Amino acid sequence: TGPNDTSPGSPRHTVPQCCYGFCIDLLIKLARTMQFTYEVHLVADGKFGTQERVQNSNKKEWNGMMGELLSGQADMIVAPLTINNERAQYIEFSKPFKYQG
Amino acid sequence: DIQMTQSPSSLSASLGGKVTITCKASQDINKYIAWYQHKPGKGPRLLIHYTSSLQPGIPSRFSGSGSGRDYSFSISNLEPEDIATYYCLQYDNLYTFGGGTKLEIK
Amino acid sequence: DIYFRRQVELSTMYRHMEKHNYESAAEAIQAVRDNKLHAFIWDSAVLEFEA
Amino acid sequence: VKLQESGGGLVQPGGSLKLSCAASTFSSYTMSWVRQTPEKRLEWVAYISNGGGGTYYPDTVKGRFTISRDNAKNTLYLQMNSLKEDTAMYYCARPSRGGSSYWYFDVWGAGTTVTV
Amino acid sequence: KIVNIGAVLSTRKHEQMFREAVNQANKRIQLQATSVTHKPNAIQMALSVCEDLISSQVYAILVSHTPTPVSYTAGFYRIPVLGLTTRMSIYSDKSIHLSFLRTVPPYSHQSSVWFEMMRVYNWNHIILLVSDDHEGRAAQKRLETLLEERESKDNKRGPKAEKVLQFDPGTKNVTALLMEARELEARVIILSASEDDAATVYRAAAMLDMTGSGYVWLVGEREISGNALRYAPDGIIGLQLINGKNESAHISDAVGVVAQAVHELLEKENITDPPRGCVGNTNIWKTGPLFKRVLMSSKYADGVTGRVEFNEDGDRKFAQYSIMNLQNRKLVQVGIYNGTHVIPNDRKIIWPGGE
Amino acid sequence: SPPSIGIAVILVGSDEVAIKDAHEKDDFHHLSVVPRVELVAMNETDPKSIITRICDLMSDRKIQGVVFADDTDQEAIAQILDFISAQTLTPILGIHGGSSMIMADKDESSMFFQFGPSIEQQASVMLNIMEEYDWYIFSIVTTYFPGYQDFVNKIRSTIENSFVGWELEEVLLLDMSLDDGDSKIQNQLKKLQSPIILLYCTKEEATYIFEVANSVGLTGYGYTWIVPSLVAGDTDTVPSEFPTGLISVSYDEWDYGLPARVRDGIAIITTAASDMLSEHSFIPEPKSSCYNTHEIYQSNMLNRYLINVTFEGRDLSFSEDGYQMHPKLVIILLNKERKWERVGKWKDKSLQMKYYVWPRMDDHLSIVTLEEAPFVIVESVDPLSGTCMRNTVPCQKRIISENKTDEEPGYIKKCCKGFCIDILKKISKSVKFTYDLYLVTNGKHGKKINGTWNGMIGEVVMKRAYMAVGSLT
């Protein structure tokens, strides 16, 4: 389920697109192994998730992808998402696919 | 603007009689009243405030009662240096005035 | 942006980074080949494929 | 502080006579003045605030009258046009407690006439 | 030992039992208790605070049922004020009125009665519906503060997680929140709002078939009302207070627990006195904070309602409980509880849609 | 053509003549409604007299709004006003004294507004003051006003933004524990190892606690104390326990003055009522009495109209919490001869002050340097903050100008980086130092001409309490 922001400025028209690659194949194997019914919809903006103090107050919400994990828009993140100290405060990770820098 | 009409036309009384003149406006005034008296060619003299509050130098000969938009103002025990004519004032919009009456002595 | 702002000793370096950042991975990769951007910082698992 | 009128006349029937009333503090004090009928009625003529605004009349003399004031010389200015059926006396009255509002004057003028 | 305690009460015979309870406490020092006539349109009642303050020897004012302005007027006036209708919590709270002291837990109660129920039934997931009010923020803060069970070192599979909603006081918009709550995996609903909000939700789970077998509700006190308890579905579990209707039992231990503070304070030094009735400005009786200190560390006039120990805010630390389960059309009391000794039941729970 | 509304002004404590004359020349014609003033003086200022005067005037007169003033320092006046406004659904503007002290958490249906700064704008101007000398925020709060929780969450709130250069927050929260034996409130003041200490408190407990600060050794020589408006806002009097100057913000020291403030409030009320009659063609009918309650929805519309007022050049609008947006602020010093002498200036972002250096600051050194390649690098300042984060120096460069005015040690403090500055920052902690770092002006570093020396050695031979770090062989 592609974004509404198919041309990443103003307009909002969501369309079915199709994806494939590394994480898609690994999701295929994990879903065949663990009995998963699944849908895949892309992210809102494309900014990988970070923390900032928003709404000129004492509130810090999480932008981007990781906020959609915190707000209940999804339940798994299968993407190149790094392991940090700031994300691992309250988001459980796994043994990490790869090793890079 | 709102306009007023006093009534009626006469203060026909003897020496020490009793007369009463009515502030009658077209709209609710909330006891917005004043009262003046003058000779022909001399100039007015203040009588009455909100609660018929008289003036220092003005005797207790003048009283009145009424509310809302209709008010009555009574004069009694009149000595004829007050050969005058009595007038009511409203100030809901900028100022308001009606007719008013003149005093004669019989 | 989290790793650079966490470190204080690299802070001046971070102060040079605020005026040139990009929004997507492909944007900076195309902008390097147009000589507007002499260097780029990202993961090895994307840069080793792109080179 | 005392009020003294001047500029009395109706030498043209249907003309225009800019009358005035000088004062001797009147700058924070509004103005409205009075003609007198043959029934001696103290009918209103015009309305100004203390600050020159709020230029109004009652329905008797609307449509003909040009209005101003000067708080430096403590004077009013208004030309009389539709008093042409009256042998009126006009006086000035300075309403007490000042302001652009109105309250009850004892501070009236002296009284001068306008005769056609 | 002729000191005064003012009071404002609802009806006439409450003053009779008030003076009789003062005569009961007279076996200790002798006392006043002149008292006057609760009135409507209470700014006149804010007028008649110093119809009672005319005695300098008044040291406590007792108030019953409205958040009354006497806490503002007679709080200048560092005079500790006791009451029994602080269920609407906001004027006994952290916007610190320096003169209040409760005799009853609020509507936004210490919600551990829910939190202690979960270890009875091993529940781990909570959908928490909360209205947009000061009550809702108080309940939210208390139930989030009740997460100190994680410091060991036993149900760590889940204490309680899921999410909360916001629920503005509107009539139509109940459907969207419950439609979104239908999708989640949690099946336990805790709803703590007003009785008109209970009369607002009122059928919306039944139209979505979120009643019956699938779900378990743990509602607060204000679902038991003539418009709300008529329309709650079968199997709702509600709470109900022990007291707060027999106010004589409150007022007897109230005059006992203020008389003990009077005896404790009379043996001390620098007993400065309050002013003589509403005279002017800067009337700050300097022994007022000392009165709050000696009252806040006191035990209870035990014998009628059980031992009540006041906290830093002024709560009771008292076992507040009675669970009413809804059978076919009537509420039933099911068990006997405590602050800690929740000794579960002696009857059978009729769970909704499958029993 | 304009009708009237009723506005009552009440003064407690002088010259009702200056207040009368100032407004009664304000011609509110050219507006759709015109006012109706009524002066009433009082001297008791107890709660019962306040209610029995206010609703007495409500019962006698068709009162639209009330402009309240005072000459006391009792804050609990305002809550009483905040009590009655929602009780009467009529606007009340507290313009002086205890009516002008800020009350947090107002009621939802209240229509009470105050002339004064917010509790967060005072912290913002307290940061803008400390951004002249790059000082370090160390806030302590002992008493517990209702305006506490906003203060720390507004003072944090900028230290994590950008280009900060700010030290840690060794904060100390205390309370009103009535316990004399708890002497750790005396003992924890040794944990304030900082030259700058913020103190948000009340006047009486500050009068107590400055004796304690003298007892521990927080004297006025090595430390300063920046203190908000509610402690020392009483411009007339001062207790004897304050050798602790640079108190913070107040309003403009004589409240434009008090009758101008009265005229501004009258203009505010009449402009809002004129806007409501221009937009919805009906004014609120006045209240019957403080007894009768039953026979308002339009008061919320009046609340929406009262907070978007504008007059001849003064946007006098209000926020949701009852304070002003723009208003004029001053900065006060304290005068070891026990006066209050400083008239500083702050307006809506900007601050303008005196001397460009703080008086009353031997281990204070002047140090003169020189710009070159990578030993002492001079760069410009940030256009949002003025100060320098990693560069950590003033480098107060002087300007050579026309020969009719002196030089500029208030020229903007250009940041210096490089090798010798990093050496100096170690030598400061090595012994004990204090910089007064500045550049040479004649540009004649290391030169001896016939008779004399110039440049850095030129400021060495002139005995100007110097070092000369930089590139110098």
Residue numbers in the entry:
A (entry chain A): 458 to 558
B (entry chain N): 1 to 106
C (entry chain A): 711 to 761
D (entry chain M): 2 to 25, 28 to 87, 89 to 120
E (entry chain A): 25 to 52, 58 to 94, 103 to 190, 205 to 406
F (entry chain B): 31 to 43, 45 to 326, 329 to 394, 403 to 514
Article passage:
NMDARs form heterotetrameric ion channels composed of the obligatory GluN1 subunits and GluN2 (A-D) and/or GluN3 (A-B) subunits.
Toward this end, we purified the intact GluN1b-GluN2B NMDAR proteins in the presence of 1 mM glycine and 1 mM glutamate and complexed them with the purified Fab2 fragment. Single-particle analysis resulted in three 3D classes that differed from each other mainly in their ATD conformations. The resolution of the 3D reconstructions ranged from 3.9 to 6.6 Å as estimated by Fourier shell correlation (FSC) curves, thus, the quality of the cryo-EM density maps was mostly sufficient to identify and trace secondary structural elements as well as the side chains of bulky residues. The cryo-EM structures unambiguously showed that Fab2 binds to the R1 lobe of the GluN2B ATD. The single-particle cryo-EM showed density for the ATD, the LBD, and the TMD of the GluN1b-GluN2B NMDARs along with the density for the Fv portion of the Fab2 fragment, which interacts only with the GluN2B ATD. The GluN2B residues involved in IgG2 binding are not conserved in the other GluN2 subtypes (A, C, and D), consistent with the subtype-specific inhibitory effect shown in the electrophysiological experiments. One of the antibody clones, IgG2, recognizes the GluN2B ATD and allosterically inhibits the activity of the GluN1-GluN2B NMDAR channels by favoring closure of the GluN2B ATD bi-lobe as shown by our single-particle cryo-EM and x-ray crystallographic structures and all-atom molecular dynamics simulations of the extracellular structures complexed to Fv2.
